[PDB]
Design a protein around this nucleic acid. Structure first.
Lengths: 95, 78, 97, 105, 97, 83, 105, 93
DNA sequence: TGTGTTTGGGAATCCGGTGCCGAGGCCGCTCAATTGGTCGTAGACAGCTCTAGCACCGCTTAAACGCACGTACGCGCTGTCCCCCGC
DNA sequence: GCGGGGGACAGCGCGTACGTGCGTTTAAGCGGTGCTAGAGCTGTCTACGACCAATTGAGCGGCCTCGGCACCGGATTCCCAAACACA
């Protein structure tokens, strides 16, 4: 029995937050997993490029933010940056 | 063996594309194009399989072969 | 009786754009993929999901190509799509030299 | 012991994203806030798509989301459509669209 | 006196420019346009000269390719004059927005 | 100085020259404005990325390398300006 | 001490390609034959393009290769054209090409 | 600061091909860009292959598979021939 | 000869029953995330140099602009013939 | 496989909009000067992330249940294509 990794439970939690009385089929969960992995790889690759471009050795939240601005369309990038900066603010404010 | 892609199948594919009227010479063209596409995908997929020492072409190989051409496909373990 | 020509074409356009299933018969496509792959490496085996992925990708590609072909046909002030429309759409897309 | 995701107020796994970043050869070193920021972005994008897809599913009197609803959600939202433009969705279908020229007079 | 027929000089200009390599947009107005566009994203931005040169090269290449596809579309419509609808069709098929 | 309404600097003869390089024999009169639109869009898409790449590097100056990188990020790679 | 390029009969720097592979985070480890194979492939492609561009330059009574000649070489060879299809070449121009419809009868 | 280029190697190859033809500085810039671009294509594809076979080294086999994936038909055939020749000669000595 | 309204009739849609299988929940387990602590160094910051980007000016001439003039191409209209469509 | 009807394609006319050419105006291009903001490089030191051993609970596999959805048949409705009314 191998080890399998997925985002099914987290996608389900987000779905319960958004539409509490709404479920998701297994095919749609597979599609959402594919989407999440795809976006993760896009953002991570762009961030890696940015880190390399500046002759820089570390991937910080600045690189993630810049990669998000580069990849996502304007309004989506704006909201995504707001959400990410809020999350990092809360994470560092607490301890 | 390309003839397995019948006239009604191409007609249906065109209908999903919003095509109202189809000329009689479309089919042999469509078959040609499709065949080319398949060769371009399968080639890469097989290359991934042979590189992996395997003899079975897996759906993951096809997914990477599609992503090769910028034809990213969601829903097959990608 | 008889339907006005082109009406059933529109009905089938709506019918097939409403649905999502595969429009190619599974077994002829599987035979074709195996035949094509025989030219690259001999005696290959395919998981069913591999052939399903290939079929989905090919159908999506052909539907997009027919969308572009329809655009070209409308541009020439026609209603019938012709092989010249396919060639022009593929040439602009950058697939055909 | 409270998890990194909990401390950041997220539901996506910050620790898992951090592990994937390290074990993905993106860079030699990974900052502390990078997995948090990345997890927040993924959670936001997933929330957007699930919003739109839930709306589309409710538009069909369906309480479950199927690939058709996700496809309609993506192709109907212009910034998502730009993002997922070169992407094909298995069992997705297409948007209902007929050229105005083809309709009868 | 002497006057060439319509279209002779058009072909002559086609041969001259398809034979040459020099840039077909005036450099100063393009530089001003680039600067005024970038003014909307961050105030007080300086540019390397080679950056504006690269931008001009890329823009002229893009527009030349677009005009090739527009001419193909126009010829496809049994016309010789390119029209804005040709540009719109070419960009629609190319996948741009 | 403020920079304003420089899109008219792409003159009609320059657009005609670009169309000639594209093999075009006859040009409609409404083409020129359409072209100035298309170009303006292309530029906005490129510059927004170049400026982003410059902001990340903390610099106040957009280099040619940022423009090259933005271009290749749009799948439109450019040869001859480094990189 | 004889260099790796000499021992493999190449003109491209095998050691330098190996260094770039190591300092490019493609993988944790790099085999011995990978830089040799990559240098051979790069040398072959460069030799092909320089062949074709020199021929094109001689076709124009020119003894130096300029970007116009490289563009003509690339755009005239169909497999090179496929390889460098999405690439634009500064000061390259286009192929002389006029549609047969536009020519007078 | 030091700068990296493939100028001298491209010039040597050209002299091996057309022994009496020179090359501009602009064309050398373009050839350098092309060599880089192809290098990154091949190396990125090889890295991808290695990580998606759960494999940790980049060997000549990964490079060869990447060449088949990137290069068109006859070009891939000849490039694979040259790469195999070079690896054979390198290991023999 | 022409404009306009109506009906049988196939085709898509709604509604109720039903049944069935996958989605959602629960449990036991394990292995990967978390804590705490050490240590090395990546980069943040200060600070310093010099280049190359910006602003300006003047002059020449080549290109852009406006306008006259003519013709040739786009577009509408008519006809026919044939080749896709519906069954 | 067949009947037929609409669309593709051919031919014609016309009218205006686009190409060609000429004279005038404008600003691009080139050179030359000067200023300074900022890019690029260097030294420090410090906080921050990698590494490791131990802890544990969150998540994953496996089972089980039932309700959401698929399917079927029957009734509702919705365009359509003649079809004749009647001006």
């Amino acid at each position: 029995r191998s080890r399998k990794e997925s985002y099914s439970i987290y996608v389900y939690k987000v779905l319960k937050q958004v539409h509490p009385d709404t479920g998701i089929s297994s095919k749609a969960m597979g599609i959402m997993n594919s989407f999440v992995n795809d976006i993760f790889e896009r953002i991570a690759g762009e961030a890696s490029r940015l880190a390399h471009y500046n002759k820089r050795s570390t991937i910080t939240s600045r690189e993630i933010q810049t990669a998000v601005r580069l990849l996502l369309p304007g309004e989506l990038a704006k909201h995504a940056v707001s959400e990410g900066t809020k999350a990092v603010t809360k994470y560092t404010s607490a301890k | 063996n390309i003839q397995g892609i019948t006239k009604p199948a191409i007609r249906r594919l065109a209908r999903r594309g919003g095509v109202k009227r189809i000329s009689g010479l479309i089919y042999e063209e469509t078959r040609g194009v499709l065949k080319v596409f398949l060769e371009n995908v399968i080639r890469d997929a097989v290359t991934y399989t042979e590189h992996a020492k395997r003899k079975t072409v897996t759906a993951m190989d096809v997914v990477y072969a599609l992503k090769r051409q910028g034809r990213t496909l969601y829903g097959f373990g990608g | 009786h008889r339907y006005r020509p082109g009406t059933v074409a529109l009905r089938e356009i709506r019918r097939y754009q409403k649905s999502t299933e595969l429009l190619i018969r599974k077994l002829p496509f599987q035979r074709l993929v195996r035949e094509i792959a025989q030219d690259f490496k001999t005696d290959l085996r395919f998981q069913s999901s591999a052939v399903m992925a290939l079929q989905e990708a090919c159908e999506a590609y052909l539907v997009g190509l027919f969308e572009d072909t329809n655009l070209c046909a409308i541009h020439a002030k026609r209603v019938t799509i012709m092989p010249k429309d396919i060639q022009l759409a593929r040439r602009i897309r950058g697939e055909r030299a | 012991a409270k998890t990194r995701s909990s401390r950041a107020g997220l539901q996506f796994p910050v620790g898992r994203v951090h592990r994937l970043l390290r074990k993905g050869n993106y860079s030699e070193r990974v900052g502390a806030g990078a997995p948090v920021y990345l997890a927040a972005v993924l959670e936001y994008l997933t929330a957007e798509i699930l919003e739109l897809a839930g709306n589309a599913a409710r538009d069909n009197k369906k309480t479950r989301i199927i690939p058709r609803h996700l496809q309609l959600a993506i192709r109907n939202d212009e910034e998502l459509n730009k993002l997922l433009g070169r992407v094909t969705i298995a069992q997705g279908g297409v948007l209902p669209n007929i050229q105005a020229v083809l309709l009868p007079k």
